[PDB]
Structures are given as structure tokens and as C-alpha cells.
Amino acid sequence: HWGYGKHNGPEHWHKDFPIAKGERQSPVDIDTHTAKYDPSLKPLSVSYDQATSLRILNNGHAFNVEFDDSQDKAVLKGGPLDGTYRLIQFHFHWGSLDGQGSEHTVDKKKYAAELHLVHWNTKYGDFGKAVQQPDGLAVLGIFLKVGSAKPGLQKVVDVLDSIKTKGKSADFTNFDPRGLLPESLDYWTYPGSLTTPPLLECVTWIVLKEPISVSSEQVLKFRKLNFNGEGEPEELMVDNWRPAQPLKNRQIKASFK
Numbered sequence: 001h002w003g004y005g006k007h008n009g010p011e012h013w014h015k016d017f018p019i020a021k022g023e024r025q026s027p028v029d030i031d032t033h034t035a036k037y038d039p040s041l042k043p044l045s046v047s048y049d050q051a052t053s054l055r056i057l058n059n060g061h062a063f064n065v066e067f068d069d070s071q072d073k074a075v076l077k078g079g080p081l082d083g084t085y086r087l088i089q090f091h092f093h094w095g096s097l098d099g100q101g102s103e104h105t106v107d108k109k110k111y112a113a114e115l116h117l118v119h120w121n122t123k124y125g126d127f128g129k130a131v132q133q134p135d136g137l138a139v140l141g142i143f144l145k146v147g148s149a150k151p152g153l154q155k156v157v158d159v160l161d162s163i164k165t166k167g168k169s170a171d172f173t174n175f176d177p178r179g180l181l182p183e184s185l186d187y188w189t190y191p192g193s194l195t196t197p198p199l200l201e202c203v204t205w206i207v208l209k210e211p212i213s214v215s216s217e218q219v220l221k222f223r224k225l226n227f228n229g230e231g232e233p234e235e236l237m238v239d240n241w242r243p244a245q246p247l248k249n250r251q252i253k254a255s256f257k
């Protein structure tokens, strides 16, 4: 089965998932000098107010926090999105070290981790149908510096012991994801894919410029998680990121100067 090691890693993914060498794969490197301001972009609308988180899960790849997406209560509009995308889950990618962990790079620079808040276009009814469409999903990417602690992440960090190994899941109601947001909503956007299998090319990417600082103690607990299942050889969940991909025939736009 696919993973992040030497024998099942990203370089082995094209065999079971030929789209890996597709035309719009993610992540990519965002060259800040060639990225172009897009006057045509409508202001981004993040409305995670009546967001209802339910549980967190270790899927032997990351840890995800799930949301009731049975109403338009947490939504992402505006910017490149011509529609309304509903929040369903969010998850992280981090490294074994602070100088790596992010999936997207900025001028080749690699962050300690990267946050993916995931949304699906409501005109397609469910997520299963959404994922089969070029404009199916929109994912909000936020970078993570190691520095000062992020309070709105700690409630997450503290429940990570109860979901150490693949298959485990704990209750995670009443978490507000707005705490994970940075100050500015300035972003690069491009047409991309999922960054793990099945690597479907169904995603509009909105990667924010301004990262969040999390403490060294915080990201350290992400690293204490296991890839393996209970009572198996202990693989540490670290470096769960796919390297940047050929941009090919794509422009990374920007929402500023």
C-alpha cells in the first residue's frame, strides 16, 4: 500500500495512480516573482462561524478533524471560486525537522508544516461527486513557522495521544478553526490536485502568504504520532508531505502587490 517511505513513497505512486505524472498535480513551488496579481479576483470569504467539528482521526497518513457538512455553516466563497464550497475536514503535513514538512514551497523555501482546510462545491451535492469534477473542491493552504505557540491549535495537540496509531479516532466537538487562521488573507491560487492518492485533479488551491507560528513543543507532538496500527512496528508519522511538482501549463496568480 502507498505511503511516504523509500519503497512506497511519492516516487512509487505513478504505478497505481498514473495521474501522478498528470497535467495539474500538487503541490507545486510558488515563485513569488513570476506569480502575477490578478485584478479579477473577488475578495475571499472565509465563514467558519457556525462550523461544527465532530471527531479527529489518524488514517495512517495524517490526522484529520472532521466536520458536520450537512448544512452551509462553514463556507468558503469569493477569490477564484465561482460558487460556494462547504468545509468538511482539515489535516496537517509536517516534517521530522523544522526546515521541512510543508508540501508547497515559496521560492523553494520549505516550512515546518502545512495546514489543509478542505471544502467541496455544493452544486455537486456530495463530496464523492465533487471529487470527480475539475472545480470540485477548494483547499485552503496555510504555512506553519516554528516560533510562538498558536493557542487555537493546542486543543488539537492535546487530544493527539488518544489517536496515536492508524485507525484510532476521538471525539472533537466544539473546536473553532478560525484560531488556525493567520491575520492576512493574501493568497496565491492555481488549479491543482489532491496531494495524496487518488491524486484527483479536482482542486482549486488557495495558499495564504502569511504563515502561522506554532511552538516547537506543538509541532513536536505531531511527530509523536504513528503511521502504523496498534501493536505493529512503530513507524513515526513524520515527513508526510509530497514534494513539489511540475507546474507545466499553469500560472500561480496572486491577490495583491
Ligand SMILES: CCN1CCC[C@H]1CNC(=O)c1cc(S(N)(=O)=O)ccc1OC
Pocket (backbone or CB within 6 Å): 064, 066, 088, 089, 116, 118, 127, 139, 193, 194, 195, 196, 197, 198
Ligand atoms: C475524512 C474525510 N474524507 C472522506 C471524505 C472527504 C475526505 C477528506 N480528504 C481529502 O479531501 C483529501 C485531501 C487531500 S489534500 N487537499 O491534497 O491534502 C488529499 C487526499 C484526500 O483524500 C484522499
Ligand SMILES: [Zn+2]
Pocket (backbone or CB within 6 Å): 091, 092, 093, 116, 195
Ligand atoms: Zn493535505
